[PDB]
Amino acid sequence: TKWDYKNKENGPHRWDKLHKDFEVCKSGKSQSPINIEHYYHTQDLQFKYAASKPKAVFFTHHTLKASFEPTNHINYRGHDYVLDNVHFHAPMEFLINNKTRPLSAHFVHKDAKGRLLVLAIGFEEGKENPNLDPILEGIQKKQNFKEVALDAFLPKSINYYHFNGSLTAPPCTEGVAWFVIEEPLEVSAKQLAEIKKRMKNSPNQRPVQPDYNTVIIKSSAETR
Template sequence: MKAKFLIDYCHQGDWEPLGGQRQSPIDIQTSQIENNNSLANIQVNLSETTATFLNNGQNLQLLGAGQASFNNRVFNFVQLHFHADGEHRLDGKIFPLEGHFLFQSASGQLAVIGVLYQVGEFNPDFEHVLNQYDQGKGEGSFSFAGLIPENKSYYHYLGSLTTPPLTEGVEWYVMQNVLEVSAEQVLRFIAIHGRNNRECQSINERKVLSYNE
């Protein structure tokens, strides 16, 4: 079933409010990445019991329970959604799909784990998400094992939400390890959701850091 949304990806210049100097997504240039010893590993613990699937007018989301630790700070899981094509690039490479795991701390700070997917093997966990998206309603069990890398080495920078209101100050943790979904699954997502990737934004004076697990 084709989903309907309130934002138009064909006219991104009309989105309000227009962003500042720290917008997302970006093209991550690995030759310009800086190592930083102050970063720490990411720990993610998401509930695999029940999750609610929701169309919030911008994307199809999975709402669930769980937590993550970013640099030894606890954040609560808010929602997961996907973009096709992928929004972040690696050395100019465009990926067919990207997942965004959104978390929020008690103080309101937002952090997003970005996962890039390439075409390859069939992904059972993504198939379950697609089945729920296709229904456009309801609840179902949720497994993230095939949706987020076991090795959580990451690229880190400060950016924004990639949908209106394009809020800045978001901590981004883009996974270095790329997972797989099948070509048929990508096409099925596009058939349901449409193409929904924001154009790459200028990195300006920002630095991209890396952490290797």
């Protein structure tokens, strides 16, 4: 009974069935991901990202993950959150106005209390991405892992939909603070393809979930 995104006995349709920890995958009223169609415009969020060497780059639970030493942070409303990892989904899991991207990255953060702030940004096919370099190369070796350009990773000025949701994979824990960033980065078709290859050419995209009038704001901030 190991969960996956395959439409068989162990898919998303049935995560709630595989363990009793996963019940909130079906019973939960703030589940991710969803379609960002309806939101509110408006006017808080501070980025402390230094280029860092991963403490490890690996395949786990259908995703490609880079973990970090807790030297990086996000500050949202005085509360502080440290970057734990960056992992990937193909295709992108959240949908902005029913538009799909081929890939997205998730910058998971935690506070000392374990509350999560997750940061989602999407990828489209095109220009080669410098910043992917140490991850594609870091995954081939357990290495003195080369640094990732975190401060340079996502746009300086950014527009996002902030809302509360859940983890997008079991155990689908809610209370998660989602910041989904409208502007996609580009990725080489080769770059994209080996990422897909390295996630075992098998998509790790949870289906959009029942939305119970989720209150979404669209806003702006600066990430440098």
